[PDB]
Paper text:
KDM4 (JMJD2) is a conserved iron (II)-dependent jumonji-domain demethylase subfamily that is essential during development. Vertebrate KDM4A–C proteins contain a conserved double tudor domain (DTD) and a potential zinc-finger domain at the carboxy terminus. From our biochemical and structural profiling, we find KDM4A, KDM4B and KDM4C DTDs display different histone-binding preferences. We show that these DTDs use an aromatic cage as a general mechanism to coordinate trimethyl lysine and, most importantly, the sequence specificity is largely determined by side-chain interactions with surrounding residues.
In dramatic contrast to KDM4A-DTD and KDM4C-DTD, KDM4B-DTD only displayed striking specificity for H3K23me3 (Kd=10.3 μM), with no significant binding to H3K4me3. As KDM4B-DTD also interacts with H3K23me3 with high discrimination, we investigated whether KDM4B-DTD engages H3K23me3 using intermolecular interactions similar to KDM4A-DTD. Indeed, KDM4B-DTD binds H3K23me3 with sensitivity to PTM states on H3K23 and neighbouring residues in a similar fashion to that observed for KDM4A-DTD, suggesting that the interaction network with H3K23me3 is shared between KDM4A-DTD and KDM4B-DTD. Analysis of the KDM4B-DTD structure reveals a highly similar overall tertiary structure when compared with KDM4A-DTD and KDM4C-DTD. Indeed, the KDM4B-H3K23me3 model displayed a similar interaction network as KDM4A-H3K23me3, including the hydrogen bonds with H3T22 and H3R26. To pinpoint the residues that account for the poor H3K4me3 affinity of KDM4B, we looked for apparent clashes or missing molecular interactions in the modelled KDM4B-H3K4me3 structure. We first noticed that N960 in KDM4B-DTD showed a significant steric clash with H3A1 and H3R2 in the model. Indeed, with the N960A variant, H3K4me3 binding was rescued to Kd=303 μM, whereas the corresponding substitutions in KDM4A (N940A) dramatically decreased H3K4me3 binding, most probably due to disrupting the hydrogen bond with H3T3. S965 in KDM4B might also contribute to the poor affinity for H3K4me3, probably due to the lack of strong ionic interaction between H3R2 and S965; such ionic interaction is fulfilled between KDM4A-D945 and H3R2. Similar models of KDM4C-DTD with H3K4me3 and H3K23me3 suggests general conserved interactions as with KDM4A-DTD, except for the H3R26 clash in KDM4C-H3K23me3 model, which might explain KDM4C's lower affinity to H3K23me3. Together, these results suggest that despite overall sequence and structure homology, specific differences of key residues result in unique H3K23me3 specificity of KDM4B-DTD.
Author numbering:
A (entry chain B), B (entry chain A): 918 to 1026
């Protein structure tokens, strides 16, 4: 429930705790996929799945075999593992300083 | 009091009303500029100003002549009028389509 203009406390650019204001917010949904190489990715944007229109239908079955477009520009096969949505925020200290801070790093009243 | 993930209603580009999800939010600085033909704009972002790096030094002096980049991609002279902060939100319909919306255009539950 963190909102625009809300005053929170988070770590500085110096690594110290100060009150700052929330001036931005974003929701990012990322997929975890397992390649055959034994490798994986966890910052796969949903639109990159080409064997299923996840933007509309939502994420595949856990363990589902999928095809995706990779940072390659090319298409590969993989196993969909998990889906995770994260909240990220932009804060502004009394500094004038700004930083991009993860929801988990923010203390609120 | 609008939050990431919250389901709201707004007009899509069809001009009709649909449920959408808030996936973004920003506290956005908007410049008002006055064109020579007598027209205005009030949703001009600070980076659009070409005759000064407003992202760092802040807004130009009031009434100041500025060169800006417009929605057609070309550069024009304009008269900086005032500066304003507005809450804007990024929403996503079940389409998968998205829209950038002012807080005032949003109906909430």
């Amino acid at each position: 429930a963190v909102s625009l203009g809300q005053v929170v406390i988070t770590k500085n650019r110096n690594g110290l705790y100060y009150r700052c204001r929330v001036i931005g917010a974003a929701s990012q949904t990322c997929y975890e996929v397992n390649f055959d190489d034994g490798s994986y990715s966890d910052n796969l944007y949903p639109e990159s799945i080409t064997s299923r229109d996840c933007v509309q239908l939502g994420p595949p079955s856990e363990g589902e075999l999928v095809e995706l477009r990779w940072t390659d520009g090319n298409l590969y096969k993989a196993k969909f593992i998990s889906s995770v949505t994260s909240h990220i925020y932009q804060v502004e200290f009394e500094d004038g300083s700004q930083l991009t801070v993860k929801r988990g790093d923010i203390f609120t009243l």
